[model samples]
Target: SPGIWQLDCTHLEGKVILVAVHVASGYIEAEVIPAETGQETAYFLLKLAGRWPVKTVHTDNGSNFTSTTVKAACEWAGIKQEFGIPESMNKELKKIIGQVRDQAEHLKTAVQMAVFIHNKKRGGYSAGERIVDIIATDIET
Candidate 1:
């Protein structure tokens, strides 16, 4: 929804955080990025798309998500970008993010773990197990 998760006057500062969730499994992946540009977001999403089956990226109208860099990147990857946060998802995510406080918690890792746990719970998994596995088993030769 914002820039490459950069450092703000808040808990998430200067770090370009890339957050993604497996829609089917709710397996989330977040990363701390150093750059503060759409390029980083584009690159990050592209890379992540390579590892998993990424189709649509839901985001706000931020330049990072709307910029040609990100747009082209998603197009090349065959991933469509959707603007605007869901009606309630941001508030729900923010509620979790708010607990950290602005510069009060003092560790990006905390937020990282929070996102992980959130994803885990969202997927109905305890920890490492993802719902994706239940739908598709490991391929064997």
Candidate 2:
């Protein structure tokens, strides 16, 4: 089971403020907001945790994720936050995400599909000895 989330910044009209989460249940929760700052990120994360507890979160080294607000939120929620390496290092993931982001006219669908494949198709080690096989391995690798 995997959960994927994407926040819509379209409502903000070019402000790039949105948040999304992909849980381990293959379900997604997305939110649209006016800003993409740390405070807004914290708010969205808090809301998500309130609805469903998150044990861990993986995100890029975006300012929003690394800010004090987001850090505090993670601390309070008892969630471990892991930041992915720079895009340059994870070229595979970047390429896959880039292809989806570039050609897809519908952001929502692209985001959904991306998460779906990432969780179901790829293969890698996770959670100690657990080896999770994912569906998007072909596209990612």
Candidate 3:
């Protein structure tokens, strides 16, 4: 199965923050570093991709993702890099943003319960849904 990965750079303590997400499983990983450039992003990506079976990566046109180092890493990995169209990708962009915005509430028991219900009980998007198709064909393609 194909998977979606996202990278975001943040600032922390006079340094950079690299955040990566596995969209299919809602698995998130983050790191705090000293810079937010292509070199740092490519290093982190190579490390993560080594551990995961990532075939395609989606990212914004940030300098980090577009930089030569990062692009070369993707090429070496044989991973297709998908760049969002300006302003349009914000729809899916909000999906991650919504998660961050609701992190506090989602961390609560009720929210967790709701996620459980929707995911397991009610069969949320991941429950045999064509989320992958939508993401790959409609969104990224």
Which runs in model 3 stand beyond 4 Å of their true positions? Answer: 85-141
- Which runs of model 2 end up more than 4 angstroms from their true locations? 1-13, 85-141
Evaluate model 1: give its TM-score: 0.58
lDDT tens digits by residue: candidate 2, 1-141: 232332223232243425353433333444444454677778878887787546566666465564798889878977776655211212333344456776666655555445444434524543211212332432365
What does candidate 3's lDDT look like per residue over 20-55, in tens digits? 656654444555544546676777778877876677
Could you tell me every candidate's TM-score relative to the true structure?
0.58, 0.47, 0.54
Kindly give the number of clashing pairs for every candidate.
10, 20, 0
Poorest lDDT segment (10 consecutive residues) of candidate 2: 126-135
What does the lDDT come to for candidate 2? Answer: 0.49
Which is superior by TM-score, 1 or 2? 1
Task: For candidate 3, give the lDDT of residue 53.
Answer: 61
Clashing pairs in 1: 4-16, 5-15, 5-16, 5-17, 6-14, 7-13, 7-14, 7-15, 8-13, 16-33
Query: Could you tell me which 10 consecutive residues in candidate 1 have the lowest summed lDDT?
Result: 1-10
